[PDB]
Symmetry: D2
Subunit: 284 residues, 4 copies
Amino acid sequence: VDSVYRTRSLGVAAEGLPDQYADGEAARVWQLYIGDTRSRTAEYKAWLLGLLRQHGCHRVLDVACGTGVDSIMLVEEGFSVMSVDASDKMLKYALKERWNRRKEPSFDNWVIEEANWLTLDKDVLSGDGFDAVICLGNSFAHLPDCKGDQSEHRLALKNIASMVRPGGLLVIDHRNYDYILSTGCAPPGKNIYYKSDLTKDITTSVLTVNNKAHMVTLDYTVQVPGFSKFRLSYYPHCLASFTELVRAAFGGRCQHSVLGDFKPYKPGQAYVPCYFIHVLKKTD
Amino acid sequence: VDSVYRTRSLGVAAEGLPDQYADGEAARVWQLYIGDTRSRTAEYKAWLLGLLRQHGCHRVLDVACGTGVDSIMLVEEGFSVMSVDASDKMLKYALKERWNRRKEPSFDNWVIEEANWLTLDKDVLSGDGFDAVICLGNSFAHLPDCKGDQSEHRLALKNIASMVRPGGLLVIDHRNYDYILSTGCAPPGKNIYYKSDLTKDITTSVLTVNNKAHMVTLDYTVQVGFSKFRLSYYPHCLASFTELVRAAFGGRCQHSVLGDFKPYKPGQAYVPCYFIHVLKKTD
Amino acid sequence: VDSVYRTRSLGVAAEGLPDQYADGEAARVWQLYIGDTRSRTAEYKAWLLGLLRQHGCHRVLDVACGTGVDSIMLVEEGFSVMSVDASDKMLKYALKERWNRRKEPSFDNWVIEEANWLTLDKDVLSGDGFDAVICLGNSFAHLPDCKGDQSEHRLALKNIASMVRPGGLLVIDHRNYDYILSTGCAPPGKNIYYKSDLTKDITTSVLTVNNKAHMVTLDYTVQVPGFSKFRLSYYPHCLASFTELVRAAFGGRCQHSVLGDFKPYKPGQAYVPCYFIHVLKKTD
Amino acid sequence: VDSVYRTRSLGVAAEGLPDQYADGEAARVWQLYIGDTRSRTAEYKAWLLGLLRQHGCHRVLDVACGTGVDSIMLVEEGFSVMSVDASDKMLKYALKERWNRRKEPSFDNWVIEEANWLTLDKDVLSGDGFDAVICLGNSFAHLPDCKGDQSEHRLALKNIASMVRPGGLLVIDHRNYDYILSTGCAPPGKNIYYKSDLTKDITTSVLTVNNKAHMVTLDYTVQVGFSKFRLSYYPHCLASFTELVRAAFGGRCQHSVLGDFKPYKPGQAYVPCYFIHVLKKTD
């Protein structure tokens, strides 16, 4: 018999009613988690603001923009910023803060739109390109290897990369997964961008498929006014592999450096970085 | 062993990524369905616009507001409109149009906020009260009877009703479910508010529990192509609803019930598609 | 990302380990429910035993046989009985009691096999047919209308019917759904075959599709050493509709009567039967 | 609203009807997989048959017995065999063959009953104790570490072990997971017991939690056609298991560990596919 009746389809919405799982438990802890960006680190403000300024970057695209924190600063410092993301749940908060602050011209002129790394080319009229494209805070890693061959990773970078104007920069990052795969632990409270305020506990689960590392899945355990859980997954980009992927994205025509945590990275140095930042420039 | 590993929890989102089921098939047809409000009927414009005007309503709250089309009109016609809904996916579009139309003052002054019928009291600083409260297009019926006794229907109306300022109006509606339950079929394209544009086909599934009707589930099956989604409804019979909604003000009210915009005399020839309930407060 | 990892596939089994949901709650109440056949009613023993004997039936097939209670009696009274069912979970108990009682020749000679109404023809070498085919206790109604047109109902009966030898009988039954659709209540403790011993409570849920009755779904609430629940669904066969279906099954070449509860049925009689039993004979 | 109506509960069955997922795709390939025991290896016949015989074992309990192939041999060779498993779907087939072969006495006297490692004590009137207890073909590994501390592994062995009569044997095995965890790959067709017949292809997924290996999940992908199923395993490393299984007798034991049937000297050239643990009791 074993059918499966449902009161509404997965994905739809009705007017008096909270959507899908929006009122649930994981969702409400996870809303604390993403709203955990109040102290932006001064080091990071210094570094990115100085990276852009140093290369004369003024037109910037923030791909994977989230609630928009990184973008809010860019906007604040007089940049010209377009911000995209594929997730409405997070874009809601960019959109919100933008309305909230609509009187400010800098912010009236802020563009927030939906777009998807896999279709980025058709989803953002790039014009003759952007000065900087930033994808920070380790979000590229949310893109999973569904097809098995990393062809998606490849297309996502190719698309992102193509957003970048000649002589422009792509500033893209990932957690040091080399280390995570090594300790088998993804340390909490190590976010170099926004020092975290939530006290939170973390179990790390690593899936290895036919002896190639395939997923890191983090289950967070947070305290409220309470012990609530939620789970997120990541693709573990070892530093070599990502280096290759991202280079190939521009064909090969690039200046390419890779940062420690904002300081440079000499392979075999005593200090172990928590993130690797890839700053890429182009051709001509 | 029968454990169930997931890659993310139900209800969360990550940045590079489309949410949960937003990219799926039923979601895309259903997006067609709710964006199917281009021709608002002139009859409806006339009626509601005239309802509010003859009772001197200016401060109106659109409970369950959706993409916000009713609200867009009220705004446009120089009303002072606050619109709430509990659904982000829907509110997105009111929010969207609003931004889109942000250089018009009438619109800069539009308020769109999240709120839930069951917590509507502590969700909307109601002030003195609102002039009119509209809940149109049959959305009250989206609230299901989960507990089994309709206590939630009751609270929902009580909260809504309390949003209404003394001598003010509640304008709330439901499909003619009495009929729907007589025929067993919910006819397609009878939406008296927004003349539908979409060649759509409908399967009506009625659930009856211990002999009490309990749910209408509609399977909309749409030409894009040949795709489907399903929505469900609590079937309010006219009496039941009239009782519920009256009691919501305790009982201090001027209660009339509309056909489709024209009055309703029980036993009249014409069978209405919707029942509109226009209420005012006496204490 | 929203994949869905699983430790084993739906439907498989591993050796140290209880199957799928077999240890769960609904399963354990429901095991009480099906094992609720200790007092077989004397009236029913009298009637069926006398139906078969009256028509000289000795080779009988019990299609949809369950734990095998009806079959156990047939076997006990010196009948020659083949019993089939499509469900291993229930056939386990027929099989069990058959081993348990293996010394008895009557029972050594009991045949229990798997077969499916929809493929019954290929699933049971019918030989030149059976004398009686019994499908009692309202199990035909477990067969749902998945395709929407009742073509399955039609094929299931056609197949069952074809099991019946020329001049033989088909003895098939259904709950009075006419009444159930009417009261909207499926009364508990009304089983005319095995008087029930479990004290149990019942919520009736009727699904009507485009104004045609489509499902009755019963949620049972039982007491143990405890208040445990479980749910079963049924196709509501109104008496006219089933009459038609079953007749057409033999093409039309039949004697056809329909019983009250074991007594005859004159439409419009004061007594409202809880089951309708259809006794069919054939051609020549 | 997001309720989930079902037509029957998980775990029940109705009569005209195939159960739950029994007719589905993965179930049919997997039925091929477990019925893939036709050629038992002659080496294995020899070994186990010889193991029991030199230690004068006659009363043997096949814990986790499955379709019952190991058991069918023991029976055939005139042993006195009781076989348990917690899985109906598997037991069906032991039960089946048994009935099929019921006119042979050796078989009429075969006992097949349901029992669960975690409740094995109060599940099997153990009498004085069994001569041998076999749990072969790597089935202990099907018991997962649900609680997180391996306390269930521990109880399971304790119960099993207690089935063993003083001076009697426990013969229990596991794949070489140490290797599996070194390479990351679980090679196909290394089953030392039953020479596989089925051209099958395998994807090895290892789960590591806070740095401790936690699960092997195997995706078998079979030529019938091109279908799939998945099974999971707790990877017992040799030390861990040796510890677990020793402790199960408290510590009163004669413990040896086999290569694939030949002894095992740690650091030897040959890397075994399975580890067989033959234990006896001293008090």
